[PDB]
Write an enzyme that holds these catalytic residues in place. Structure first.
Site, PDB file in Angstrom:
ATOM      1  CB  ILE A 158      -8.037  -3.682  -7.924  1.00 48.06           C
ATOM      2  CG1 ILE A 158      -5.908  -3.817  -7.483  1.00 48.06           C
ATOM      3  CG2 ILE A 158      -7.548  -4.894  -8.829  1.00 48.06           C
ATOM      4  CD1 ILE A 158      -5.304  -2.678  -6.503  1.00 48.06           C
ATOM      5  CD  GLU A 208      -3.919   0.590   1.178  1.00 45.31           C
ATOM      6  OE1 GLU A 208      -3.378   1.505   0.241  1.00 45.31           O
ATOM      7  OE2 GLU A 208      -4.747   0.128   1.152  1.00 45.31           O
ATOM      8  NE  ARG A 243      -4.295   3.906  -2.247  1.00 49.73           N
ATOM      9  CZ  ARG A 243      -4.589   2.745  -2.524  1.00 49.73           C
ATOM     10  NH1 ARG A 243      -5.163   1.600  -1.531  1.00 49.73           N
ATOM     11  NH2 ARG A 243      -5.636   3.075  -3.277  1.00 49.73           N
TER      12      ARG A 243
HETATM   13  O1  LIG Z   1     -11.984   0.429  -2.201  1.00 50.37           O
HETATM   14  C1  LIG Z   1     -11.734  -0.009  -3.862  1.00 50.37           C
HETATM   15  C2  LIG Z   1     -12.489  -0.855  -4.570  1.00 50.37           C
HETATM   16  C3  LIG Z   1     -12.173  -1.291  -5.557  1.00 50.37           C
HETATM   17  N1  LIG Z   1     -10.644  -1.254  -5.156  1.00 50.37           N
HETATM   18  C4  LIG Z   1     -10.054  -1.398  -4.855  1.00 50.37           C
HETATM   19  O2  LIG Z   1      -8.861  -1.407  -4.842  1.00 50.37           O
HETATM   20  N2  LIG Z   1     -10.520  -0.250  -3.215  1.00 50.37           N
END
Ligand SMILES: O=c1cc[nH]c(=O)[nH]1
Ligand SMILES: *[C@@H]1O[C@H](CO)[C@@H](O)[C@H](O)[C@H]1NC(C)=O
Length: 246
Positions: free
Chosen positions: A71, A160, A163
């Site tokens: 993100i 997540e 994933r």
């Molecule tokens: O590790 C990170 C860094 C920026 N944004 C994310 O979702 N994860």
């Protein structure tokens, strides 16, 4: 773009959103039948927009880097917000340019920094669909300490889950009751880059990881993943971070 509405949400509709999210990430090949995210994507095509709506129908748009499901930042009414990190500053060159103002959050987006800002580790932060409603609500109006916690919820319940099928199923179980993440959830989140790497190195090494990956399982027991026949690889992981970005 992809969208998700909390109002009327159930496990089925959340699983549809996670499927849409996965399907919006581009890939040119699969490695052991898992989509391989791209090494690089130029310009505005790098970023996927996720439209999220809370129970009351208020909305934020979240910008996601399609190479690593990170993100970058989000738009809430007429204000954009971005992590304080170079990849997010770059993103701000392409997305949400018509916001009246742009706020840089006072942290980067990794778990370690977010947890410091939030005042708590994510072992102690409940997640679920009600928690995602709360997070969206929080992000609508700036509060940087509240936002860190909201963002730990948002990252887990979108990226997540995209994933890992296990993480999607854990959120489904929390459709109407939040609960802190299982130890296996935390383990997987923390192992995505390692696993992505080992799965790609196993091509050329007969399916065998060059370095085994230690995980916690669904029962809370500490297993060791050594090769592509493991259920983590055959069933669970849904996207691979390109080794070019590791
Ligand atoms: O590790 C990170 C860094 C920026 N944004 C994310 O979702 N994860
Ligand atoms: C590969 O992984 C499987 C599944 O976890 C395991 O049972 C087996 O012992 C491992 N095999 C090799 C050749 O390392």
């Amino acid at each position: 773009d992809v969208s998700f509405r909390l109002s009327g949400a159930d496990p089925s509709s959340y699983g549809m959103f996670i499927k849409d999210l996965r399907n919006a990430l581009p890939h040119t090949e699969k490695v052991y039948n898992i989509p391989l995210l791209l090494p690089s994507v130029s310009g505005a095509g790098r970023y996927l927009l996720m439209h999220l709506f809370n129970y009351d129908g208020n909305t934020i748009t979240v910008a996601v880097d399609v190479t690593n499901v990170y993100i970058m930042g989000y738009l809430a009414l007429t204000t954009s917000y971005f992590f304080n990190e170079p990849a997010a500053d770059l993103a701000s060159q392409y997305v949400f340019r018509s916001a009246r103002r742009k706020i840089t959050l006072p942290y980067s987006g990794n778990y370690e920094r977010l947890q410091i800002a939030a005042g708590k580790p994510r072992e102690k932060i409940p997640i679920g669909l009600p928690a995602l409603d709360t997070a969206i609500s929080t992000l609508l109006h700036y509060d940087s300490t509240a936002a860190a916690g909201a963002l730990l919820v948002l990252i887990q319940t979108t990226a997540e889950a995209a994933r890992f099928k296990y993480i999607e199923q854990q959120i489904q179980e929390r459709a109407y009751r939040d609960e802190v993440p299982s130890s296996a959830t935390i383990s997987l989140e923390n192992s995505w880059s390692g696993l992505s790497k080992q799965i790609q190195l196993a091509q050329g090494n007969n399916g065998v990881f060059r370095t085994p990956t230690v995980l916690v399982d669904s029962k809370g027991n500490r297993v060791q993943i050594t090769n592509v026949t493991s259920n983590v690889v055959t069933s669970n992981i849904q996207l691979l971070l390109n080794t070019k970005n590791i």
